[PDB]
Amino acid sequence: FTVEKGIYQTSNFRVQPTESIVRFPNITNLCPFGEVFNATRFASVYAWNR
Amino acid sequence: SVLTQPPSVSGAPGQRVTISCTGSSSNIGAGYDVHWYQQLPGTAPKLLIYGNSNRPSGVPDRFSGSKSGTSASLAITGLQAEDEADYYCQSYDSSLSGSVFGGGTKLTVLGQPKAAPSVTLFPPSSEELQANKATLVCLISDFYPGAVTVAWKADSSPVKAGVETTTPSKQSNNKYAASSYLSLTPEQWKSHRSYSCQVTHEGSTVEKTVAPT
Ligand SMILES: *[C@@H]1O[C@H](CO)[C@@H](O)[C@H](O)[C@H]1NC(C)=O
């Protein structure tokens, strides 16, 4: 209950981060799929492109 | 193009012969059915099996069609005397917006024994000299099989221009015959001392020569 003059270490200071970033790449690759819609002509409803 | 097939397959007369067809995920692996056809060299192809589940009329039950996911397979039991044709894969392609066929597989092992060839060399006649051309013919007849190489020489250097070889055809007595022409001109026909054709069959080389003068 009695403290004399001097320096004293009580606890430690920790800076806890508040946000997290886990993004590994800048962008992912693609596959050719726009030709399904970007086409010269389409198919009918009795025989459609799958 | 989008469908690839093996060039040839080997088999035995009495075992199971199975062909494998591989395409893409948009034509065969999407869910479309496959159709197999036989391309006989000389007759129009006909329908063998459609959908790999039904049997058309006039088709034997020895042909079996299955679809193992993205790849389709055809299996046969026993090699008869009519399987000397080509097998193709036919399936609807969404990318091509139509039907695309396969490559084709040839079904043969060996049916050609050896024989003794005989050649004949005939110089051009008198009426051929005034046509401003010289057709040198060296006929080959009575040989088996029909795989003969033709080489032309003028006793000083081989001739690599105008050399031709026709395919051999079956004779009356199950042999083969062929001919080889050589396009030349009568201007240099008389200058050269002699002309000849040289052929080689299974190591047997024979030579016949003619003299224009
Ligand atoms: C189709 O083409 C247009 C213009 O060429 C383009 O803007 C678009 O990204 C392409 N793809 C799709 C899925 O629309």
UniProtKB/Swiss-Prot annotation, chain A:
Q: Where is this region: Disordered?
A: 14-30
Describe the task this protein carries out: Attaches the virion to the cell membrane by interacting with host receptor, initiating the infection. The major receptor is host ACE2. When S2/S2' has been cleaved, binding to the receptor triggers direct fusion at the cell membrane. When S2/S2' has not been cleaved, binding to the receptor results in internalization of the virus by endocytosis using host TFRC and GRM2 and leading to fusion of the virion membrane with the host endosomal membrane. Alternatively, may use NRP1/NRP2 and integrin as entry receptors.
Q: What name does the UniProt record give this protein?
A: Spike protein S1
Q: Which residues are glycosylated?
A: 18, 20, 26, 38
Look up and give the organism this protein is from.
Severe acute respiratory syndrome coronavirus 2
Q: Which domain of life is it from?
A: Viruses
Please name the gene that encodes this protein: S
Subunit text: Binds to host ACE2. RBD also interacts with the N-linked glycan on 'Asn-90' of ACE2. Cleavage of S generates a polybasic C-terminal sequence on S1 that binds to host Neuropilin-1 (NRP1) and Neuropilin-2 (NRP2) receptors. Interacts with host integrin alpha-5/beta-1 (ITGA5:ITGB1) and with ACE2 in complex with integrin alpha-5/beta-1 (ITGA5:ITGB1). May interact via cytoplasmic c-terminus with M protein. May interact (via N-terminus) with host bilirubin and biliverdin, thereby preventing antibody binding to the SARS-CoV-2 spike NTD via an allosteric mechanism.
